[PDB]
């Protein structure tokens, strides 16, 4: 939830996200909503974070109030380490079942190897019910269920409480039998050997004697219930398969170009002005719709007319403009968008002035007469101007 | 002492050594016979790149390289041998004591 | 020869070999035979591995009992290091010349930077004359001869003896001369001094002396023989050349595409059972033929109707079957492959269930009415039955 | 200017310099000569050397004797690290103002992460004027200019040494107040207590607060001057475009092909002869021209009958011949090339029989009947003949 906190420049040149969606937001204890998304890994990767060939897909949420069923990411089923490619779209989704009452904000998110979190949006999720009632459950091979929520604890304290009881029993044993300050002054005077000598070793090599046996039964009987059992199952995944749908940037014989060409935002602000080189590439006359920076989008509500569902906070309707003139096909255009709203200051990506590099990151969306959106991506530096104000 | 041990190794052992950094042409590239040894008599664990011998730099400048290795190789066996010295004193201890 | 005990998904999903050729499977001492073969880098190269960037070339046997005169791969000459790319297969092969009087079992081999070794096929090769008579030889640039098995092994002696000899007349001399009781009982009394002061230093500034000059001596002489010599030739080599012929996974216009989906193996075993989701992609109609694992060989009688000349050990007849449905062109079709064979198990393949990877890899071969060979990659998580029966 | 000492091979088989031009080779101190060219980035890239994925251009000159205004490569200004992909080419410049009278001999220079610095080719350039006159400036974002060569110095020294005097007077001040001997003896006896206690001790928390107070103050006031500033800029730029023009080694429809087949050069020596498997792949006929290795240009005197402006050094006229017998297209041709001078001697290219890779490198350069230049790779073993005599 500390997105906020984070560098502003890196939230924009790493993951590009768009489209997230949560199935439900409400759910009963049991009941099993899904958030899902796509995101672009931008393609001028940023020296400060590991190159994104190992990450893994998460659900941004304070502990499991919602376990998770599964989750999928560039076509695969991923609860180990996947790789992504500079460059390129996944697309992903994650099946969270309810568990623990209350109103959370969850978060797509995905980690890099050496790189750190990278958090997506996020939507408060009312859960109702008693935890109590949650259950998993789970399958074996063996065919059995078993409830995860319960299964296995009371086997463990079934052999770790006793063991502490014992060490407990062998320390007060010991102490009540020969002093600390007795001792200490047997010991510091000639003996010693008062302390100890046999048969206080006859107790030590039979106290040790039933230890091992209490261990090699422990063992064999654990070893008859369970007698199957394979190794924690670890490791990268084989590579993910892209969108190629359609497009999506760099993919298909149709798509928009944008260049970057100068960029100005104010110092305190919550305005940015940048003049973009447009290239259009498809066979329909283009309108630039929406521009998403950390999992903010910025409408043209010219394209925008209504009016997404989308989480506050985050949404802005002031993404515009152009002249509204359509561009293409064949048309190449450099045009001057400004950015304006609160949330670009509300999501400290104001704070860009304090950042080691001043540059911008994300994707534009243009769109056709239709419905059609064909997605371009947008890099580069913008320089500050610094207004009076605090 | 040890700067003297540091510099007369190479030179000691060149005589042994030379015979096998003479040239042959193997299949259109340049070996010593002594890569040509390793190569033929085959080591079931033994892949080059496994090696760590010189394989260039920018860095090095000349025509130096035994040299600058030999007298690096002397410095550094100032700071083995004093150590090494005590240590042979410390093992040489006659120290005998009362309990274990 | 240990292949057995490496890790079974680690064999399976590393290098991919096939078309392993011995020359002959016997030579006499100096008679040349040669080992050949193709492989395959499999495409989700294991965590637990290096990336094959940095990999070498070599002859699995036990000591020189065969020289190597050259081996080449990626259609070069490769006596140092070579990069492998992800995806791809190299052309290989190995020429070997008889040398110690026996019977070893010679394999295909190649290692990774930080991954180990990877063995191939092997085959028994009946090897007869005697030692004695080996020879190399091998040509200088100056155009003259040397019979490597010898060359040089006299010079080293020459100089390393006589000086063993000088340390141990240096030691025997001191030694007797001033003993260690007589020495040690001086040095501990006063003195010491008994025991060194010159004219004992001057036998050492002339030992010394002498030393050095036999060093000057020594060093010039070996630079008169030998005025040439040149370093140590080492580094990695340019880049290979895959095979491109015909193919041959991922290359030209016609080609087999093998999903896995679901696969089952006994545990204990000897059986696995696979879907596999073919598309083809050829023009011709295609009956699957083999499988390829860890050098082992699975077919189907239906194809190979006979039946190959290779090493036991190694081939299965039964890599069966489909219902010889030849598939296309153009159709794509999900086929249950049985894979049964007590070579499974004798290659410790079943033991995939020990594995922190529970996971197969491998080739597959298409082909069509006439000879016409299809290769396709095919690989991911087979699960197993726990089964009776120990 | 040490490139005459790096290793042989290794400046050959890095980076392939072409068309490199000085704007000017004089100028007045602030006079504005540009130095520009293209570097190939060989494709079999020496293990001894990083990967050059980070680099930096740079001009290899005596110190500031130029003020570098601006350098851009693959067509980004890059005054931060940059990658260069193997294989490509890319093209760079550098805008230098004259600042210090005299004679020196500037480079082209790139340095490569965890390599080193590899040096281009270089002209001598004639500056004339006063140091005192040399100025820069530069423009800040408020609009204001100031004079680099002397901006911020003064109020450094400002800073700095009313701070080191008064360390020097603390000294001082103890020193002289109580001696060393007598504050020696003093401890060295009972006390001690005479050489310090209060009030020395009001005198040290004072100088204290007063130190304190300088701070927060001196700290307020270039607060407010200055009530700006950011952070140092650092960091990889986005990947640079290499030249697609044309071509341009592996760039466009038509091109040359070499291998190379063998090689020798004499040892000690001036001569190289290699035996050049071409192919060509135009549409014009062929003739090779020129033969480029670490900057020296071998020229063939039959198409460069004049005969370019290039520093001596350098520039040879023996890169001789063919039977200037055209080759193609289509043609496919092996064709012995000798190389001789005494620059591949004097910019000790012959020590290549020095090093652990007796290996060539660099670009071949064609021409058609026209001007029309086509670029082609060459690489790989030539062997060293081992000649006697002067
Ligand atoms: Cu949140
Ligand atoms: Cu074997
Ligand atoms: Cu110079």
């Known amino acids: 939830h500390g997105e906020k906190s984070q560098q502003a420049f890196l939230r924009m040149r790493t993951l590009n996200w768009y489209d997230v969606q949560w199935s439900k937001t409400t759910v009963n204890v049991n009941e099993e909503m899904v958030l899902s998304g796509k995101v672009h890994v931008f393609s001028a990767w940023p020296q400060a974070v590991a190159n994104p060939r190992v990450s893994f897909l998460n659900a941004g949420e304070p502990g499991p109030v919602l376990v998770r069923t599964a989750q999928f990411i560039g076509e695969q089923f991923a609860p180990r380490s996947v790789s992504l490619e500079i460059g390129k779209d996944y697309a992903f989704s994650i099946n969270l079942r309810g568990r623990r009452a209350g109103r959370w904000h969850v978060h797509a998110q995905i980690n890099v190897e050496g790189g750190g979190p990278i958090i997506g949006p996020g939507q408060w999720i009312e859960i109702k019910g008693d935890m109590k009632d949650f259950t998993d459950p789970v399958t074996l091979l063996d065919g059995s269920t078993v409830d995860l929520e319960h299964y296995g604890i009371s086997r463990v304290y079934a052999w770790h409480l006793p063991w502490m009881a014992v060490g407990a029993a062998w320390i007060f044993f010991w102490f009540v039998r020969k002093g600390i300050i007795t001792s200490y002054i047997r010991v510091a005077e000639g003996k010693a050997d008062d302390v100890i000598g046999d048969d206080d070793r006859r107790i030590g090599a039979i106290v040790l004697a039933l230890t091992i046996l209490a261990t090699i039964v422990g063992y064999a009987v654990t070893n008859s219930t369970f007698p199957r059992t394979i190794p924690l199952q670890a490791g990268l995944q084989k590579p993910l398969t892209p969108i190629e749908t359609e497009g999506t940037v760099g993919v298909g014989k149709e798509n928009v170009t944008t260049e970057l060409n100068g960029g100005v935002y104010k110092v305190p602000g919550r305005e940015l002005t940048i003049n973009v080189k447009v290239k259009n590439n498809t066979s329909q006359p283009l309108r630039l719709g929406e521009y998403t920076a950390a999992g903010l989008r910025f409408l043209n509500p010219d394209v925008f007319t209504t009016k997404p569902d989308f989480p506050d906070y985050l949404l802005a309707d002031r993404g515009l403009s152009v002249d509204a003139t359509p561009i293409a096909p064949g048309e190449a255009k450099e045009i001057v968008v400004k950015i304006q709203d609160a949330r670009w200051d509300i999501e400290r990506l104001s704070d860009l002035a304090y950042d080691t590099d001043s540059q911008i990151g994300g994707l534009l969306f243009f769109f056709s007469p239709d419905g059609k959106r064909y997605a371009s991506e947008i890099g580069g530096p913008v320089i500050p101007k610094f207004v009076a104000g605090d | ?100």
Request: proline share 4%.
């Open chain 2, 1 to 100: 002492g040890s700067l003297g041990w540091g510099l007369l190794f190479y030179p000691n052992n060149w005589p042994a050594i030379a015979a096998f950094h003479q040239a042959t042409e193997q299949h259109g590239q340049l070996m010593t016979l002594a890569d040509l040894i390793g190569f033929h008599f085959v080591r079931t664990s033994m892949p080059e790149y496994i090696r760590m011998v010189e394989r260039g730099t920018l860095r090095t400048f000349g025509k130096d390289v035994v040299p600058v290795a030999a007298f690096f190789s002397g410095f550094v066996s100032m700071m083995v041998y004093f150590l090494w010295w005590f240590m042979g004193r410390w093992y040489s201890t006659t120290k005998v004591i009362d309990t274990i």
